[PDB]
Amino acid sequence: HLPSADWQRAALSLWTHRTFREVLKEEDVHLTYQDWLHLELEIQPEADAL
Amino acid sequence: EPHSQALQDVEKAIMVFEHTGNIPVTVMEASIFRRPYYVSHFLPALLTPRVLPKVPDSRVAFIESLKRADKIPPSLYSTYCQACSAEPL
Amino acid sequence: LVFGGRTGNEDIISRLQEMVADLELQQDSQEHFLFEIFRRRLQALTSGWS
Amino acid sequence: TGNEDIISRLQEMVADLELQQDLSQEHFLFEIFRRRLQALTSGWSVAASLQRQRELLMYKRILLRLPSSVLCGSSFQAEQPITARCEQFFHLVNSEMRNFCSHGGALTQDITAHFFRGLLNACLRSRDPSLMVDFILAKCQTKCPLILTSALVWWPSLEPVLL
């Protein structure tokens, strides 16, 4: 779909990588529903990407 | 006449593709069994010999979907790319 | 180059979401005007293979 | 300009909770409203007055978006179980909105119509509709006289829709 396949690959390699999963557990970092809401409110219906 | 009509046809194919994804299929049919009208249609689909933006956009991604569909014999695509590079008073 | 399809308005599609739920509650056997409208437009189009 | 997908997700879940209750009880919204009004400065400072005006126009907005069923419930079951959530709304309109979202000893075209829509909806869906409407609008001579003083101004608007 979207911009450079290398950026895509980079994201997927990071997402699969173990030490990112082991970081995501002890978490303030686990994206609260309210945090998610703040970022989804940040974005506009103008420039979407989807 | 089959230039202005073919343009109105591919316009619609694309604005529909957009609210969808994955290739408005009326056109995919017209491809294999209307080969003459396919080429008279597919030429206004390659009519982007213009400012190609920084960001790939509607036409761009539609043409991308076609070339991934293994349509677009490469002659016409290569030509498309090249053209785009561009007293009395 | 017609170059895709601008959007313009979903504001108006959320003013519609109003009056749908309004008329729905006010009714609650008889059927909707939607499908009448749908049939009129599908009919008023060409029946061609063009 | 940011929000108008998420305010549609809100419509989704408000109508859900309307149906689950329709299967007497009062809405959580009015408690959230009272909590934020409470947690503001009671200070009379122009800063605080503007901040509360801001927050009440935002409340008026979210109520216009969401169904008029949140105000008057739906299907008033009898005279005994009556004025549930309407008293909730009346405290809000007396306490706060009459300060801010008003004009001229009166309310707004918008919220007046939003109210009268929900009112006639639940009343007509219920039995003895003319008598129950007469009942709630006699209550309003005592509890929220604004809605009437508003309905005097915005009658030309409502009368068509009501009729």
Side-chain angles (χ1 to χ4, degrees), chain A residues 37 40-41 43-46, chain D residues 1-6 13:
Chain A
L37 280 166
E40 188 69 1
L41 292 155
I43 54 162
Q44 275 179 353
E46 299 166 19
Chain D
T1 271
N3 343 321
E4 311 314 306
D5 210 297
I6 284 179
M13 297 136 103

PDB file of all heavy atoms in Angstrom, chain A residues 37 40-41 43-46, chain D residues 1-6 13:
ATOM      1  N   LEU A  37      -6.366   7.342  23.143  1.00  0.00           N
ATOM      2  CA  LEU A  37      -7.393   8.353  22.794  1.00  0.00           C
ATOM      3  C   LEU A  37      -6.707   9.672  22.493  1.00  0.00           C
ATOM      4  O   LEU A  37      -7.057  10.275  21.496  1.00  0.00           O
ATOM      5  CB  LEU A  37      -8.403   8.549  23.921  1.00  0.00           C
ATOM      6  CG  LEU A  37      -9.498   7.492  24.003  1.00  0.00           C
ATOM      7  CD1 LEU A  37     -10.226   7.577  25.330  1.00  0.00           C
ATOM      8  CD2 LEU A  37     -10.483   7.635  22.860  1.00  0.00           C
ATOM      9  N   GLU A  40      -5.151   9.368  18.942  1.00  0.00           N
ATOM     10  CA  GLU A  40      -6.217   9.253  17.913  1.00  0.00           C
ATOM     11  C   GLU A  40      -7.005  10.565  17.803  1.00  0.00           C
ATOM     12  O   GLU A  40      -7.552  10.821  16.730  1.00  0.00           O
ATOM     13  CB  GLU A  40      -7.143   8.087  18.249  1.00  0.00           C
ATOM     14  CG  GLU A  40      -8.158   7.741  17.168  1.00  0.00           C
ATOM     15  CD  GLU A  40      -7.610   7.148  15.884  1.00  0.00           C
ATOM     16  OE1 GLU A  40      -6.372   6.962  15.780  1.00  0.00           O
ATOM     17  OE2 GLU A  40      -8.425   6.864  14.983  1.00  0.00           O
ATOM     18  N   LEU A  41      -7.072  11.362  18.866  1.00  0.00           N
ATOM     19  CA  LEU A  41      -7.704  12.706  18.819  1.00  0.00           C
ATOM     20  C   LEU A  41      -6.737  13.685  18.151  1.00  0.00           C
ATOM     21  O   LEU A  41      -7.233  14.567  17.408  1.00  0.00           O
ATOM     22  CB  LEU A  41      -8.075  13.156  20.231  1.00  0.00           C
ATOM     23  CG  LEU A  41      -9.192  12.347  20.893  1.00  0.00           C
ATOM     24  CD1 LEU A  41      -9.116  12.409  22.416  1.00  0.00           C
ATOM     25  CD2 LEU A  41     -10.560  12.803  20.410  1.00  0.00           C
ATOM     26  N   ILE A  43      -4.672  13.290  15.655  1.00  0.00           N
ATOM     27  CA  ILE A  43      -4.772  13.137  14.171  1.00  0.00           C
ATOM     28  C   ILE A  43      -6.085  13.768  13.685  1.00  0.00           C
ATOM     29  O   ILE A  43      -6.994  13.908  14.519  1.00  0.00           O
ATOM     30  CB  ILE A  43      -4.609  11.659  13.741  1.00  0.00           C
ATOM     31  CG1 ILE A  43      -5.559  10.702  14.449  1.00  0.00           C
ATOM     32  CG2 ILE A  43      -3.172  11.213  13.923  1.00  0.00           C
ATOM     33  CD1 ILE A  43      -5.707   9.395  13.759  1.00  0.00           C
ATOM     34  N   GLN A  44      -6.151  14.116  12.391  1.00  0.00           N
ATOM     35  CA  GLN A  44      -7.249  14.888  11.738  1.00  0.00           C
ATOM     36  C   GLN A  44      -7.984  13.989  10.737  1.00  0.00           C
ATOM     37  O   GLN A  44      -7.478  12.917  10.395  1.00  0.00           O
ATOM     38  CB  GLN A  44      -6.674  16.166  11.107  1.00  0.00           C
ATOM     39  CG  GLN A  44      -6.569  17.338  12.085  1.00  0.00           C
ATOM     40  CD  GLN A  44      -5.994  18.600  11.487  1.00  0.00           C
ATOM     41  OE1 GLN A  44      -5.535  18.633  10.348  1.00  0.00           O
ATOM     42  NE2 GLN A  44      -5.982  19.658  12.276  1.00  0.00           N
ATOM     43  N   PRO A  45      -9.196  14.385  10.245  1.00  0.00           N
ATOM     44  CA  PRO A  45      -9.882  13.705   9.132  1.00  0.00           C
ATOM     45  C   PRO A  45      -9.476  14.215   7.738  1.00  0.00           C
ATOM     46  O   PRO A  45     -10.136  13.922   6.743  1.00  0.00           O
ATOM     47  CB  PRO A  45     -11.348  14.051   9.397  1.00  0.00           C
ATOM     48  CG  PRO A  45     -11.277  15.470   9.934  1.00  0.00           C
ATOM     49  CD  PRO A  45      -9.996  15.519  10.750  1.00  0.00           C
ATOM     50  N   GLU A  46      -8.330  14.901   7.715  1.00  0.00           N
ATOM     51  CA  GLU A  46      -7.812  15.777   6.638  1.00  0.00           C
ATOM     52  C   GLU A  46      -6.658  15.006   5.966  1.00  0.00           C
ATOM     53  O   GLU A  46      -6.788  14.696   4.747  1.00  0.00           O
ATOM     54  CB  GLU A  46      -7.503  17.141   7.294  1.00  0.00           C
ATOM     55  CG  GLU A  46      -8.759  17.784   7.900  1.00  0.00           C
ATOM     56  CD  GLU A  46      -8.715  18.958   8.868  1.00  0.00           C
ATOM     57  OE1 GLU A  46      -7.705  19.675   8.946  1.00  0.00           O
ATOM     58  OE2 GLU A  46      -9.753  19.172   9.507  1.00  0.00           O
TER      59      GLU A  46
ATOM     60  N   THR D   1     -11.813  19.465  14.846  1.00  0.00           N
ATOM     61  CA  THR D   1     -10.980  19.231  13.630  1.00  0.00           C
ATOM     62  C   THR D   1      -9.788  18.378  14.110  1.00  0.00           C
ATOM     63  O   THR D   1      -8.733  18.927  14.510  1.00  0.00           O
ATOM     64  CB  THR D   1     -10.815  20.554  12.861  1.00  0.00           C
ATOM     65  OG1 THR D   1     -11.913  20.637  11.953  1.00  0.00           O
ATOM     66  CG2 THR D   1      -9.547  20.693  12.061  1.00  0.00           C
ATOM     67  N   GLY D   2     -10.024  17.062  14.111  1.00  0.00           N
ATOM     68  CA  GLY D   2      -9.393  16.063  14.998  1.00  0.00           C
ATOM     69  C   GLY D   2     -10.316  14.884  15.345  1.00  0.00           C
ATOM     70  O   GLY D   2      -9.802  13.746  15.424  1.00  0.00           O
ATOM     71  N   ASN D   3     -11.625  15.103  15.545  1.00  0.00           N
ATOM     72  CA  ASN D   3     -12.439  14.313  16.521  1.00  0.00           C
ATOM     73  C   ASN D   3     -13.625  13.515  15.940  1.00  0.00           C
ATOM     74  O   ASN D   3     -14.237  12.720  16.720  1.00  0.00           O
ATOM     75  CB  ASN D   3     -13.079  15.203  17.596  1.00  0.00           C
ATOM     76  CG  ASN D   3     -12.477  16.584  17.724  1.00  0.00           C
ATOM     77  OD1 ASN D   3     -11.264  16.739  17.630  1.00  0.00           O
ATOM     78  ND2 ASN D   3     -13.319  17.579  17.944  1.00  0.00           N
ATOM     79  N   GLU D   4     -14.050  13.772  14.698  1.00  0.00           N
ATOM     80  CA  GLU D   4     -15.458  13.501  14.279  1.00  0.00           C
ATOM     81  C   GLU D   4     -15.657  12.033  13.876  1.00  0.00           C
ATOM     82  O   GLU D   4     -16.809  11.697  13.529  1.00  0.00           O
ATOM     83  CB  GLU D   4     -15.908  14.462  13.174  1.00  0.00           C
ATOM     84  CG  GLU D   4     -15.629  15.940  13.468  1.00  0.00           C
ATOM     85  CD  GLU D   4     -15.971  16.490  14.850  1.00  0.00           C
ATOM     86  OE1 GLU D   4     -17.121  16.326  15.243  1.00  0.00           O
ATOM     87  OE2 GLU D   4     -15.097  17.091  15.516  1.00  0.00           O
ATOM     88  N   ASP D   5     -14.614  11.195  13.957  1.00  0.00           N
ATOM     89  CA  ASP D   5     -14.746   9.712  13.993  1.00  0.00           C
ATOM     90  C   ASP D   5     -15.085   9.251  15.420  1.00  0.00           C
ATOM     91  O   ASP D   5     -16.015   8.431  15.612  1.00  0.00           O
ATOM     92  CB  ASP D   5     -13.479   9.022  13.480  1.00  0.00           C
ATOM     93  CG  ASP D   5     -13.811   7.698  12.829  1.00  0.00           C
ATOM     94  OD1 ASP D   5     -14.308   6.841  13.544  1.00  0.00           O
ATOM     95  OD2 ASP D   5     -13.667   7.572  11.612  1.00  0.00           O
ATOM     96  N   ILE D   6     -14.340   9.762  16.390  1.00  0.00           N
ATOM     97  CA  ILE D   6     -14.474   9.383  17.823  1.00  0.00           C
ATOM     98  C   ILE D   6     -15.847   9.827  18.346  1.00  0.00           C
ATOM     99  O   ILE D   6     -16.448   9.053  19.129  1.00  0.00           O
ATOM    100  CB  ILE D   6     -13.259   9.935  18.596  1.00  0.00           C
ATOM    101  CG1 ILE D   6     -12.065   9.037  18.266  1.00  0.00           C
ATOM    102  CG2 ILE D   6     -13.518  10.114  20.094  1.00  0.00           C
ATOM    103  CD1 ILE D   6     -10.764   9.415  18.893  1.00  0.00           C
ATOM    104  N   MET D  13     -22.125   3.741  21.202  1.00  0.00           N
ATOM    105  CA  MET D  13     -22.174   3.202  22.580  1.00  0.00           C
ATOM    106  C   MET D  13     -23.334   3.856  23.356  1.00  0.00           C
ATOM    107  O   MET D  13     -23.920   3.121  24.188  1.00  0.00           O
ATOM    108  CB  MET D  13     -20.813   3.387  23.262  1.00  0.00           C
ATOM    109  CG  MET D  13     -19.708   2.605  22.562  1.00  0.00           C
ATOM    110  SD  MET D  13     -18.169   3.522  22.352  1.00  0.00           S
ATOM    111  CE  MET D  13     -17.192   2.798  23.657  1.00  0.00           C
TER     112      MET D  13
END
